[PDB]
């Protein structure tokens, strides 16, 4: 039906020529870039817009990160895959752009996808080919199919497109049909991607293969129970051992259309996961409610991959809300740090940074224990461009109603706050005092156990244009853009409306990952 016996190749452009055009676009932007917010230790394009992480793998001794790339502007546009790699996850290098639209079935965009090591030890790429359904523009909705490509070399500098391996039964779906992941379970290969059903419900479809090339429709692996959710972008699906040592499955997706409620689903679209069980032949059986990967302002389209031992996840720091002032600066968007996924005794995922992120530290400045015996502030450093702050708050002996750090604390009185808030029992990233961007605040919940524990650990990464806040060794994370003003950028320890006892505060200067 819609699963060809062999890959369908409809070459319409010279791939090498379209790649060369794309290199010029990103290089032109890079040369005129304003570095005020450009990351020192996060992955961005050298120029232009990025979104979703793609093709994540550890392959032939190297860490690979690809990403949705618009080479020709700082807003979303004709989609390419950019590429960076590393031997150690600390020191990165720019690779040639990997994919530009060159086949009929992808002529309006090379959309998101994944990479997986086959039975022969060779990598395969699976990605979506995008067409405008009306053949013109977005007014008529999307026309999307799944594509295969194979690397030309172990370095993944280039790939040969094989063409379309799964077509779209256009009249059985609501346009959205994208973002494949391929994995092996037992003696079968499986593929999942996101679909808007004919009834406009968000679904993940499942296909199987003996050879990773010819696919068979199996069933709908999962449908989102919220009728407001019409699409599941960037689906994820992987096994992980629970505390009992039983095998669970994590389903993840970037959900479109859920309405906000209290603190929950506040971003325009929201990415999250459920933990449950899966037997091949059956649908996913959730055992949890939907939970956000990241509770911050700017996080979407996460993808995970396995390095042989660890399941590792990157998110795109998504700016969905105007104004987006970095779009004036010749780049837009970066990825988060890579996070190791663990499943704790608390029955939830933890996403601490991978151990390699300690290699970002140039130094360790130990400020020791700090007591604010009255409401007030203490400057930790007058200027911080790119730092990691580790701090332990003594909840039991602090009366402050709100306590933590002000980062990007500039001479104009602007700052971003990272605080424990005793009135809501949450960690809060508050951008109210940002001089630019859409401001607002984001909260991460603390369990009854965490609130009763009498200490709270924060690990805060401050880059030129963003913050990443790891709570209690990655039980929760908040990633937000932070639009620092001109001049020195202080870090202050602040106690509002009472006392603060900090058991430990330690600063590390962050090195460049070599991509700027
Ligand atoms: O750039 C297009 C890509 O971005 C997403 O919409 C999610 O951000 C994916 O579903 C799509 O493949």
């Amino acid at each position: 039906g819609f699963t060809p016996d062999a890959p369908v190749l409809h070459e319409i452009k010279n791939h090498s020529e379209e790649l060369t055009k794309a290199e010029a676009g990103v290089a032109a932007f890079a040369a005129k870039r304003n570095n005020r917010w450009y990351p020192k230790f996060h992955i961005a394009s050298n120029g232009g817009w990025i979104n979703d992480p793609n093709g994540l793998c550890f392959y032939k001794g190297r860490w690979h990160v690809f990403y949705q790339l618009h080479p020709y502007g700082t807003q979303w546009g004709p989609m390419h895959w950019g590429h960076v790699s590393s031997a150690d996850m600390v020191n990165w290098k720019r690779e040639p752009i990997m994919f530009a639209p060159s086949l009929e079935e992808e002529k309006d965009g090379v959309f998101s996808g994944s990479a997986v090591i086959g039975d022969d030890g060779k990598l395969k790429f699976y990605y979506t080919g995008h067409r405008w359904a009306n053949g013109k523009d977005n007014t008529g909705g999307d026309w999307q199919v799944q594509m295969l490509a194979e690397p030309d070399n172990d370095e993944l500098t280039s790939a040969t497109k094989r063409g379309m391996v799964i077509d779209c039964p256009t009249d059985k779906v609501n346009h959205h049909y994208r973002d494949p992941k391929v994995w092996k379970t037992g003696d079968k290969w499986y593929m999942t991607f996101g679909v808007s059903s004919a009834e406009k419900r968000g679904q993940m479809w499942l296909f199987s293969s003996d050879d990773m090339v010819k696919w068979t429709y199996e069933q709908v692996l999962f449908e989102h129970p919220d009728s407001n959710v019409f699409m599941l972008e960037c689906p994820d699906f992987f096994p992980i051992k629970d505390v009992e040592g039983n095998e669970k499955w994590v389903i993840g997706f970037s959900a479109m259309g859920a309405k906000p409620s209290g603190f929950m689903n506040r971003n325009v679209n929201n990415a999250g996961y459920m933990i449950g069980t899966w037997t091949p032949g059956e649908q996913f059986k959730p055992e949890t409610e939907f939970r956000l990967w990241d509770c911050g302002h700017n996080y979407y389209a996460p993808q995970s991959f396995n390095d042989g031992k660890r399941q590792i996840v990157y998110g795109w720091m998504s700016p969905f809300v105007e104004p987006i002032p970095m779009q004036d600066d010749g780049w837009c968007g970066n990825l988060t740090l890579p996070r190791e996924i663990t499943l704790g005794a608390d029955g939830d995922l933890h996403t601490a940074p991978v151990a390699e992120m300690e290699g970002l530290r140039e130094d360790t400045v130990d400020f020791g224990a700090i007591d604010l015996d009255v409401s007030g502030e203490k400057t930790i450093v007058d200027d911080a461009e790119a730092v990691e702050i580790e701090m332990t708050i003594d909840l039991a002996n602090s009366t402050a109603e709100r306590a933590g750090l002000r980062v990007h604390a500039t001479e104009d009185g602007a700052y971003t706050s990272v605080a424990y808030d005793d009135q809501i029992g949450r960690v809060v990233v508050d951008r109210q005092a940002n001089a630019q961007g859409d401001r607002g605040y984001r909260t991460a919940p603390l369990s009854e156990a965490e609130l009763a524990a009498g200490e709270l650990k924060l690990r805060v990464y401050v880059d030129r244009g963003c913050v990443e806040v790891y709570v209690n060794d990655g039980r929760q994370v908040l990633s937000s853009y932070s639009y620092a003003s001109e001049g020195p950028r202080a870090i202050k320890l602040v106690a509002e409306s009472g006392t603060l006892k900090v058991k430990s505060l330690v600063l590390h200067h962050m090195k460049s990952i070599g991509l700027e």
Side-chain angles (χ1 to χ4, degrees), residues 226-240 242-284 286-303:
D226 177 1
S227 59
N228 293 137
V229 172
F230 60 88
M231 175 55 177
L232 302 182
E233 293 178 311
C234 303
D236 204 358
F237 199 60
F238 62 82
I240 190 168
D242 79 7
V243 66
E244 263 166 89
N246 288 149
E247 174 172 282
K248 311 313 282 213
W249 285 78
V250 176
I251 203 152
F253 44 73
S254 293
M256 306 183 78
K259 288 165 159 37
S261 187
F263 293 122
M264 183 56 179
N265 283 320
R266 295 310 311 211
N267 291 339
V268 166
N269 293 317
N270 306 267
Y273 61 86
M274 311 168 99
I275 310 176
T277 59
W278 181 60
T279 308
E282 301 185 351
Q283 290 183 312
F284 177 64
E287 299 176 334
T288 69
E289 77 285 5
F290 176 78
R291 299 178 178 159
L292 300 174
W293 289 103
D294 187 290
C295 292
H297 289 91
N298 306 107
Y299 189 100
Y300 200 68
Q303 188 176 106

Side-chain angles (χ1 to χ4, degrees), residues 346 395 425-426 444-453 471-472 475-476:
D346 59 5
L395 289 179
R426 297 192 167 218
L446 292 167
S447 63
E448 296 236 312
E450 289 172 294
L451 286 175
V471 182
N472 284 336
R475 176 53 206 287
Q476 308 292 342

Side-chain angles (χ1 to χ4, degrees), residues 104-121 123-135 137-171 173-198 200-213 215-240 242-284 286-308 310-337:
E104 190 53 29
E105 287 80 15
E106 72 191 26
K107 68 185 184 192
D108 303 307
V110 176
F111 271 25
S112 284
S114 53
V116 62
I117 300 173
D119 290 315
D120 61 352
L123 203 74
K124 282 164 169 40
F125 296 100
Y126 300 88
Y127 69 87
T128 299
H130 175 76
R131 274 170 294 183
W132 302 118
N134 71 6
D137 61 58
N138 74 354
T139 63
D142 308 330
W143 185 17
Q144 283 163 1
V145 306
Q146 323 315 330
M147 311 290 290
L148 166 75
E150 297 178 323
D152 299 323
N153 52 62
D154 286 352
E155 302 93 4
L156 305 187
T157 65
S158 66
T160 295
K161 294 177 184 177
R162 282 196 67 190
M164 165 180 74
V165 286
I166 298 181
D167 207 340
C168 188
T170 256
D171 61 19
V173 308
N174 177 44
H175 289 295
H176 306 280
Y177 195 85
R178 59 176 175 283
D179 304 344
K181 180 190 189 88
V182 170
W183 77 95
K184 203 183 190 184
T185 292
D187 298 302
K188 280 289 173 166
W189 288 96
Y190 292 99
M191 184 190 306
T192 195
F193 56 83
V195 175
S196 196
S197 72
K200 303 191 170 51
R201 306 298 298 269
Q203 300 185 332
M204 285 167 57
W205 286 21
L206 187 71
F207 298 71
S208 72
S209 178
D210 303 303
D211 68 8
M212 304 179 81
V213 172
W215 295 88
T216 301
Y217 180 81
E218 286 293 343
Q219 66 195 120
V220 170
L221 179 63
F222 174 83
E223 168 177 288
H224 199 299
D226 177 1
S227 59
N228 293 137
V229 172
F230 60 88
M231 175 55 177
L232 302 182
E233 293 178 311
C234 303
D236 204 358
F237 199 60
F238 62 82
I240 190 168
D242 79 7
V243 66
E244 263 166 89
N246 288 149
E247 174 172 282
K248 311 313 282 213
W249 285 78
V250 176
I251 203 152
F253 44 73
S254 293
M256 306 183 78
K259 288 165 159 37
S261 187
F263 293 122
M264 183 56 179
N265 283 320
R266 295 310 311 211
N267 291 339
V268 166
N269 293 317
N270 306 267
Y273 61 86
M274 311 168 99
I275 310 176
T277 59
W278 181 60
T279 308
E282 301 185 351
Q283 290 183 312
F284 177 64
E287 299 176 334
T288 69
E289 77 285 5
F290 176 78
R291 299 178 178 159
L292 300 174
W293 289 103
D294 187 290
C295 292
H297 289 91
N298 306 107
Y299 189 100
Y300 200 68
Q303 188 176 106
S304 80
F305 72 102
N306 198 279
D307 70 359
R310 297 173 298 176
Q311 196 84 14
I312 297 164
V313 59
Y314 282 94
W316 161 44
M317 295 193 60
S318 48
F320 291 136
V321 182
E322 298 288 341
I324 307 159
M326 60 176 161
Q327 287 181 343
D328 290 336
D329 294 0
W331 74 288
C332 189
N334 56 263
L335 305 185
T336 71
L337 299 188

